[model samples]
Target: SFQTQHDPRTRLGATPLPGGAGTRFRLWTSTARTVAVRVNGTEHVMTSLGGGIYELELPVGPGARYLFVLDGVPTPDPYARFLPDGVHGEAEVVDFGTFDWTDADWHGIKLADCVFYEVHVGTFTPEGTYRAAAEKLPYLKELGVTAIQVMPLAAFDGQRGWGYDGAAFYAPYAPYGRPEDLMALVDAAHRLGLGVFLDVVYNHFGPSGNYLSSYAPSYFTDRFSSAWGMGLDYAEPHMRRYVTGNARMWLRDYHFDGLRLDATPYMTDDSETHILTELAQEIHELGGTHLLLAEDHRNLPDLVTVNHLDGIWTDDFHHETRVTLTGEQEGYYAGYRGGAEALAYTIRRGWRYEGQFWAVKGEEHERGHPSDALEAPNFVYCIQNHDQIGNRPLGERLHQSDGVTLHEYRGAAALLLTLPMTPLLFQGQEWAASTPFQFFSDHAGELGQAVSEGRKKEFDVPDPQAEQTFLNSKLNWAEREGGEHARTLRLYRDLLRLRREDPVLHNRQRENLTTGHDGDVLWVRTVTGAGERVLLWNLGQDTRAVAEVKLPFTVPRRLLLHTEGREDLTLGAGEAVLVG
Candidate 1:
């Protein structure tokens, strides 16, 4: 006899029956007095299951469109897999199991081995589609980054966005090709020996096109409010199921290597298990080496504990490096001094601040508590990212800042690539593409105007609702072929190659790292079983003799890589060198 299968909460959407003879539909709505399924202009009554759930079975085949009638008003399913006519339209039936897979032999890589290239699909390339982005996978592979961390592609209002304001959790942004197209991107990346991960937003839903509250008020909570919207009700069983189900679906159906959770600090769940922990367990239980990287402002080392997540973004390294490079001490940056001491502490420990008084916050709040057993790969580090660049008052890149030269940026790149932490790069950052990743969106009507006004008041930048603002953010790939841009691209390529090919540099152990600096001269020494390698940075005013400077490692017979062409024994200002 066939096994009696139990219904899982993931079965909220329409599912095709055996032999494609019919479809089984399920939805959860506590506020609805009556629920019915409208199939192809025919309204059929639904059976009310316990705990605010409604279920119906119909003899429907593929391509059948349906809508849920709640209290005499028709609305789309909350767990829609495909929305052909946008978020406000009817839900289309899609069989995620039907997509062909070519990655049977493909397994994901360790977080330590990942050199991440983060991309926003709408502005990553001129043709903003999954197929178009997939076409550039070969270029990224050639660039030597092991993985691609794509921004959110969930359904949002209108057309273009940074994907943070996502409304539909399951539906892929229709403009970026169909769901199959996204799967094809993953399939292509796997075939190219590159891992592909997705960025997911679970802190709060978008401002517009979200209808969860209309169905059940219990989906959201007033206990804690986030910067985006009301916090999701993680304590609720159905709510927990909804989130955990989404996590599993992405890794299972889409064949993605992992997920990068956005702004996890906003996911305020005071439960004993913590929703974040539960989600991690669900993802890990799927049986593959799936990664879960959290973008948390709070430097909580428990985030990388065995029961929590795989890794977290380390802002200490970035902030320390930025302050050292630009000498800016305004806003939250005032917490960091960006000296060699800060860099040394950050390298030795995972976080720079651990239970120290923060001058910016004016409170003695504890930051991170890391153990010596933690690996260097537990933290992800980058010189710049969307938050650092786009959150600026003018949305300017590091190269566009005043008093910062090309050599300085090159030197910073060298430092980041040589660090033991997992390195991530923003889109167009490799070649220093002349594109500004501004905070732009296409929310229609009054919501669009509100966003524009709010952003202008908050950041004093151009109108975020303008179409040209988004167009200006697209990467100009042609620039990589000429001038200083070509040199920067080559520099990044060679540095990544060295990081991969060198035995001493390839080791990602935290205990193997040592650092020290005198005045503007900073150095990091890495010791591996094979040998020792050192990186020297000259953040001074003029050329300095290598022998005169007190370096952490001994001077080498031959230099490996230099930001500026050195002459004899002296290295130029705003320059860096690598030796073994």
Candidate 2:
């Protein structure tokens, strides 16, 4: 349902002409005195179309491999669509129009209805390929997830990596599968009535096989430095096209329903029209159902409004739950007081530190000023994620954290699912898989050695370079059939079913919602036109009794779901119950 209004002068990559007439190749490099496309054992000189734009036409069609020669220095295209021989090799011409898609009837899932299951393709399955991932769609659909949010698939160095260090931004990671294979995954997901979202990194390029600096030094900026590398030159016109175009291609060509922008704060741009805002406008102009979710820690509400980012990855809810369950408040946790009250604040007002003086940062950090105008779906909450688990010393899940009992873990899961905000689950979180989601990478040369040594010195845990570290992270799907893991998976299934079927639970309105905590019990009551629903949890270890639990509706309510089999109004220590 999307179409590209091609402007030959502005398009920065190879585009095959309709039918088999020829192919249109373009590249922008202000520094290149001479630019040519070397393909089929012949160098074809390109015409400079002024403003650092070069253009050429070839009779060759798709699958033609070529390299861009900048002043006789051969290098791969900065906007390569297909990197068959990896990052250090030639760029292959891929006709995105050639793919067969049968997802015409598919629209997209709304933000309010999204139950995101985050997956890392490399370790998602034993096969670790696009077709392998597609085969698991039925499992996810049966588990009651509305969408799957995949980690970055862009081409990075070596055969294994986290995909964040992406060098070839346009190409899919070759090891995962061919580009069309990725498209087929999306197509299969849509046919199964599930949405697929792609995670993309644009803040900085990877450290290895990066040819951007060689041809266009202006692509990077010295004004500011990102955590990974030099900040991108968003001020440049071609740079803007490179970023915005990449976003559009994912949604249009790949048939992805949405995108999760990785770490937006690091993409510092002071231009009058920020790059994020531009991306939102471009995606919106494409005319279809699409979402742009941003991962930001600054707690700024304008990120969703001004930037047009549909929702934000909210960490406040997770921090509150982590602190209440583990009772550990050090480092970043020092900024949060983990308790039932903290969780209540997040439920009522989408942000915890709304324009408050942050004690941990020792500054009056501005945050969530415009959240009052937003709905609950505008905030994405999860009990566990890659950073929360993998960044830890032992790569432990929230339940594996010290002092966390299985009872509390189930209670937390109930609370996360019942809340009005959109929920995301880490790959193996549904059944509490015994595998650790460790951080592992395979960057070669000096960077690899430095990364290995630095990670060892930083954490008192297993070495990231060891083969076992990566092997240990793979999820065991067979665990879903055995022990308490099966029960936990069922609990998640039932909770997701309730969220989908119950009107009061899925309602996004905040005006008719109330939250409070009595001793160890935290309760949230929501009232909709259909009816009222109450979520009660015992966050502490010790048992607590209430004379009468406050509710919008009377007693004799139907028991929707509970941590324990016993259906009663009263909650045991570390138990949770939902009533409708």
Candidate 3:
């Protein structure tokens, strides 16, 4: 049914041959049943090199158009950054050796210093192109965000989707503009002193029109699975190389500062030397502070220190803060009912759900690892991310939920942003982007229908079919420049500026911070170079003005940041006050 596919097994042995290996050289493929390495349109039948490798020494190497064909199906180059003509076009060897990077004097941006704002290019702007996104770099620079976490640039079946269900791991998605356009953004951000963190998906390939299977067997595994698709078998030698090699290509070749690995929990690899730890070591060895951040929600603290990863998205902080901000204890918010007690314990202990019984999961679950030593960066904390917002039925935001006010939202955001952990903000979250980020896809043909059906089946418990599953997720960018979006955006800017200007927020030592609480009110106090500051949040529905609440501060403080209702330095019901 398919054309001749290149033996992916051959790709495993591809090494940087000594050419001083001249321009013209051969690439060997040993297991290609019907080998043809198509350069531009001209097909080169790569000679067999025995074993599982096949050989195709390039007659004319360097900047040439070449794609492989094992049987008959034409495919893109697996390591291509620019699919200039198209996915089926020639794979040009534009040597990254071209750029004389001025940043050589530039050590990479440290992850601890990054104020990350995650953006999806298509939905981020009404124009929906890389150029348009580049224009926003200035805005981000002003927002005090030191880094930009751009969603996947990989080519997928359709023009849309979250980019998680990517079909082409190598080719940059065409609709987002060509490879140069993407590079331009990176270059521009670099010039502005902003680091770039690419949100890369390697957990599982998208099912719709994915062709990698033809090139390799057992690329996926039934041993482990995820909502995205079947698990990718990392234990398979070729698969291991394919993924680790891809990680190298991104950091070594493209010069990306770091990668935000999506769903590392779903990544199935049985090797003793875990691919994540190995890849992290490889990246670090390459002469840069190259970072590897994982988005594993299983409260895997060991993923950071044990695996030598930089950081992971800690959802427990969010869960605790959300419950602390809003007393409504439903669904995932059940674990955070202790309000400031939970906040204090989380910051002090590194995990809020440490050995606590989970009501939602209905088990006495425990995070049994040793406490996060304040040695390196701990975890990335955020009030909300793409998953929390988009995965919700009807794409509802925290603001849309009952009893949540703009003041409460701002207070929760302020506390989370100032925590010792790295704080990340979703695109529209800072400016309070009113547009709900619902789940959306652009897959076509039978695969599209299959995905739609699958999603409905998966979320059957919540009746996702009746909610805004696909159509509602697209952002309305027109409102970004004005109205509530503008105001929220400005608020986020102020918050970031405050963090940078204040010494207390930058102190990464969790031990430096202390928290105390009454039944419905909580106080978080921290000491940074700027001096001591205290944040008080009342999770109760009614306002409680305290004449004086004993706090953990070594010194008495004056009122600093507070909600609109508590302008007189009095704590109101459901209001938060930040004092120093």
Write down the TM-score of every candidate: 0.96, 0.96, 0.87
lDDT by residue (313-425, candidate 1, tens digit) is 87888888888778898787888887666676677776787666677855436665544646889889998888898888677888887778888899889989998889999
- Measured over all alpha carbons after superposition, the RMSD of each candidate to the real structure, in angstroms, is 2.5, 2.2, 5.3
The clash count of every prediction, one per candidate, is 0, 0, 27
Those runs of model 1 whose alpha carbons end farther than 4 Å from true positions after fitting are 1-10, 361-364, 371-373, 565-569
Q: Which scores better on TM-score, 1 or 3?
A: 1
lDDT measured at residue 291 in model 2 versus the true structure, 0 to 100? 96
Q: Report the lDDT of model 2 for residue 460.
A: 59
How far is 497's C-alpha from truth in model 2 (Å)? Answer: 0.7
Over all chains combined, what TM-score does candidate 2 have?
0.96
- Mind giving the per-residue lDDT tens digits that candidate 2 earns over 84-167? 889988888888888999999999989988999999998889877889999999999989999999999889887777788888
The TM-score obtained by model 1 is 0.96
Compared with the true structure, all predictions reach lDDT values of: 0.84, 0.84, 0.68
Please report, as a residue range, the 10-residue window in candidate 2 with the lowest summed lDDT. 1-10
